[PDB]
Design an enzyme around this catalytic site. Sequence first.
Site, PDB file in Angstrom:
ATOM      1  N   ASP A  71       7.784   3.378  -3.460  1.00 24.84           N
ATOM      2  CA  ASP A  71       7.103   2.093  -3.496  1.00 24.84           C
ATOM      3  C   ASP A  71       5.595   2.277  -3.496  1.00 24.84           C
ATOM      4  O   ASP A  71       5.068   3.372  -3.289  1.00 24.84           O
ATOM      5  CB  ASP A  71       7.531   1.204  -2.327  1.00 24.84           C
ATOM      6  N   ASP A  73       2.095  -0.257  -2.206  1.00 21.54           N
ATOM      7  CA  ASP A  73       1.584  -1.470  -1.573  1.00 21.54           C
ATOM      8  C   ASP A  73       0.321  -1.892  -2.309  1.00 21.54           C
ATOM      9  O   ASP A  73      -0.641  -1.120  -2.382  1.00 21.54           O
ATOM     10  CB  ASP A  73       1.281  -1.252  -0.089  1.00 21.54           C
ATOM     11  N   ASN A 109       8.330 -11.483   5.557  1.00 17.42           N
ATOM     12  CA  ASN A 109       7.440 -12.177   6.483  1.00 17.42           C
ATOM     13  C   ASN A 109       5.979 -11.881   6.174  1.00 17.42           C
ATOM     14  O   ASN A 109       5.134 -12.782   6.231  1.00 17.42           O
ATOM     15  CB  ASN A 109       7.757 -11.797   7.929  1.00 17.42           C
ATOM     16  N   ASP A 123       5.292  -3.796  -2.876  1.00 22.69           N
ATOM     17  CA  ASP A 123       5.039  -4.761  -1.816  1.00 22.69           C
ATOM     18  C   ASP A 123       3.664  -5.374  -2.026  1.00 22.69           C
ATOM     19  O   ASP A 123       2.688  -4.654  -2.260  1.00 22.69           O
ATOM     20  CB  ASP A 123       5.126  -4.110  -0.436  1.00 22.69           C
TER      21      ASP A 123
HETATM   22  N1  LIG Z   1       1.610  -3.238  12.182  1.00 25.50           N
HETATM   23  C1  LIG Z   1       0.769  -3.075  11.133  1.00 25.50           C
HETATM   24  N2  LIG Z   1      -0.553  -3.292  11.265  1.00 25.50           N
HETATM   25  C2  LIG Z   1      -1.429  -3.147  10.258  1.00 25.50           C
HETATM   26  N3  LIG Z   1      -1.059  -2.773   9.027  1.00 25.50           N
HETATM   27  C3  LIG Z   1       0.241  -2.525   8.748  1.00 25.50           C
HETATM   28  C4  LIG Z   1       1.256  -2.658   9.801  1.00 25.50           C
HETATM   29  N4  LIG Z   1       2.441  -2.350   9.242  1.00 25.50           N
HETATM   30  C5  LIG Z   1       2.200  -2.042   7.940  1.00 25.50           C
HETATM   31  N5  LIG Z   1       0.887  -2.149   7.654  1.00 25.50           N
HETATM   32  C6  LIG Z   1       0.226  -1.900   6.354  1.00 25.50           C
HETATM   33  O1  LIG Z   1       1.224  -1.636   5.370  1.00 25.50           O
HETATM   34  C7  LIG Z   1       1.115  -0.286   4.918  1.00 25.50           C
HETATM   35  C8  LIG Z   1       2.499   0.305   4.771  1.00 25.50           C
HETATM   36  O2  LIG Z   1       3.219   0.203   5.999  1.00 25.50           O
HETATM   37  P1  LIG Z   1       4.525   1.149   6.081  1.00 25.50           P
HETATM   38  O3  LIG Z   1       5.652   0.368   5.426  1.00 25.50           O
HETATM   39  O4  LIG Z   1       4.715   1.650   7.495  1.00 25.50           O
HETATM   40  O5  LIG Z   1       3.978   2.372   5.145  1.00 25.50           O
HETATM   41  P2  LIG Z   1       4.721   2.954   3.855  1.00 25.50           P
HETATM   42  O6  LIG Z   1       3.908   2.422   2.679  1.00 25.50           O
HETATM   43  O7  LIG Z   1       4.597   4.439   4.090  1.00 25.50           O
HETATM   44  O8  LIG Z   1       6.148   2.459   3.930  1.00 25.50           O
HETATM   45  C9  LIG Z   1       0.267   0.448   5.946  1.00 25.50           C
HETATM   46  O9  LIG Z   1      -0.536   1.476   5.364  1.00 25.50           O
HETATM   47  C10 LIG Z   1      -0.608  -0.643   6.513  1.00 25.50           C
HETATM   48  O10 LIG Z   1      -1.802  -0.764   5.734  1.00 25.50           O
HETATM   49  N1  LIG Z   2       0.126  -5.949   9.296  1.00 27.12           N
HETATM   50  C1  LIG Z   2       0.455  -5.725   8.000  1.00 27.12           C
HETATM   51  N2  LIG Z   2      -0.504  -5.592   7.056  1.00 27.12           N
HETATM   52  C2  LIG Z   2      -0.201  -5.368   5.766  1.00 27.12           C
HETATM   53  N3  LIG Z   2       1.064  -5.264   5.320  1.00 27.12           N
HETATM   54  C3  LIG Z   2       2.121  -5.378   6.163  1.00 27.12           C
HETATM   55  C4  LIG Z   2       1.872  -5.622   7.587  1.00 27.12           C
HETATM   56  N4  LIG Z   2       3.073  -5.687   8.184  1.00 27.12           N
HETATM   57  C5  LIG Z   2       4.014  -5.505   7.224  1.00 27.12           C
HETATM   58  N5  LIG Z   2       3.438  -5.326   6.020  1.00 27.12           N
HETATM   59  C6  LIG Z   2       4.140  -5.085   4.740  1.00 27.12           C
HETATM   60  O1  LIG Z   2       5.321  -5.884   4.684  1.00 27.12           O
HETATM   61  C7  LIG Z   2       6.468  -5.046   4.532  1.00 27.12           C
HETATM   62  C8  LIG Z   2       7.654  -5.583   5.316  1.00 27.12           C
HETATM   63  O2  LIG Z   2       7.257  -6.669   6.148  1.00 27.12           O
HETATM   64  P1  LIG Z   2       8.111  -6.927   7.482  1.00 27.12           P
HETATM   65  O3  LIG Z   2       7.161  -7.247   8.614  1.00 27.12           O
HETATM   66  O4  LIG Z   2       9.082  -5.770   7.587  1.00 27.12           O
HETATM   67  O5  LIG Z   2       8.927  -8.255   7.073  1.00 27.12           O
HETATM   68  P2  LIG Z   2      10.445  -8.546   7.545  1.00 27.12           P
HETATM   69  O6  LIG Z   2      10.349  -8.761   9.038  1.00 27.12           O
HETATM   70  O7  LIG Z   2      10.808  -9.786   6.761  1.00 27.12           O
HETATM   71  O8  LIG Z   2      11.225  -7.317   7.136  1.00 27.12           O
HETATM   72  C9  LIG Z   2       6.050  -3.673   5.025  1.00 27.12           C
HETATM   73  O9  LIG Z   2       6.744  -2.639   4.324  1.00 27.12           O
HETATM   74  C10 LIG Z   2       4.567  -3.629   4.736  1.00 27.12           C
HETATM   75  O10 LIG Z   2       4.349  -3.064   3.440  1.00 27.12           O
HETATM   76 MG   LIG Z   3       5.541  -1.001   2.224  1.00 30.77          MG
END
Ligand SMILES: Nc1ncnc2c1ncn2[C@@H]1O[C@H](COP(=O)(O)OP(=O)(O)O)[C@@H](O)[C@H]1O
Ligand SMILES: Nc1ncnc2c1ncn2[C@@H]1O[C@H](COP(=O)(O)OP(=O)(O)O)[C@@H](O)[C@H]1O
Ligand SMILES: [Mg+2]
Length: 290
Positions: A71, A73, A109, A123
């Site tokens: 994926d 972002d 969300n 995403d």
């Molecule tokens: N709790 C959080 N607070 C701030 N940013 C978040 C959070 N969760 C996700 N993100 C943002 O979304 C990106 C991807 O989250 P994650 O799904 O853990 O990484 P990946 O792209 O490796 O799956 C992070 O680099 C961050 O910028």
């Molecule tokens: N704080 C954050 N900032 C930026 N992106 C985020 C953050 N939190 C989640 N995301 C993005 O949203 C994706 C999933 O959101 P998530 O909170 O898991 O929703 P749900 O609860 O519906 O699964 C993550 O993989 C990440 O890429």
């Molecule tokens: Mg992601």
Amino acid sequence: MANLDTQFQEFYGELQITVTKKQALITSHNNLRTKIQKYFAKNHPEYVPSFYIQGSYKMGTTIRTRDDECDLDDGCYFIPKPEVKGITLQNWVMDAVNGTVGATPVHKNKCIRVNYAAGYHIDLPVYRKERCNDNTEHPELAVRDGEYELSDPREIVQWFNSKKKDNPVLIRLVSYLKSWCDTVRGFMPPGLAMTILASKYQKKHEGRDDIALRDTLKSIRTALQANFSCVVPGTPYDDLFESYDSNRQEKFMSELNGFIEDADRAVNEKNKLKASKLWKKHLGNRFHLA
Ligand SMILES: Nc1ncnc2c1ncn2[C@@H]1O[C@H](COP(=O)(O)OP(=O)(O)O)[C@@H](O)[C@H]1O
Ligand SMILES: Nc1ncnc2c1ncn2[C@@H]1O[C@H](COP(=O)(O)OP(=O)(O)O)[C@@H](O)[C@H]1O
Ligand SMILES: [Mg+2]
């Protein structure tokens, strides 16, 4: 004793997105941007979206999963701030990406997720921000279920960039740990947690990624035993472990204990096949001796 550095390097190579999928990801992400831009130009030209690749793809730590899923972002920003609810901005982006050939969108969300039948997703976290070129202003993340949340995606990238400098093994360590999470799943934390923990608690052993990962695992364990938390850099009180009850914490720390125990046994193994099996048990089936 067996030296598995080469096997770790090859494993890192196997974790990379394939040529074909990376090109498809990038092409699709460009098509999504144009689709969203055209949608707002036609239906709500009072709001202009702009884009910024964030997350693991921007940080250089993306891996494909055991199912060959990967994926990207791509943050979707509206500047200046639209005076509407976050779910409203998300709904418009969802409407905009709907109809993409070979894809189905899902309204999460905190992002719009576009799932492609070809085996990848994009995403789209949605933001509003008042000024076009001001890094001191943190953007507001749109949230489907609640109020906007202050966020700092660019600050995370800058922070990790400073950790990576003169330190190329770090992206490999993060990739190994992400593959561990991808192997166990269930209670395991997200990739962002592995990025933060490896960056904060990295231990080094030049020439031996296997020993470096073992040492780093024990360093992570020591830190989490003292204080089980994983705060996002630049956003205080954004603790990735804040929702983990005692059961989820115990499950993760137990898996970390088992990983460390097997890593210790592997590093002390004379038999290279047995050592590789001990690592592969936790890192997944893309790790192998052959
Ligand atoms: N709790 C959080 N607070 C701030 N940013 C978040 C959070 N969760 C996700 N993100 C943002 O979304 C990106 C991807 O989250 P994650 O799904 O853990 O990484 P990946 O792209 O490796 O799956 C992070 O680099 C961050 O910028
Ligand atoms: N704080 C954050 N900032 C930026 N992106 C985020 C953050 N939190 C989640 N995301 C993005 O949203 C994706 C999933 O959101 P998530 O909170 O898991 O929703 P749900 O609860 O519906 O699964 C993550 O993989 C990440 O890429
Ligand atoms: Mg992601």
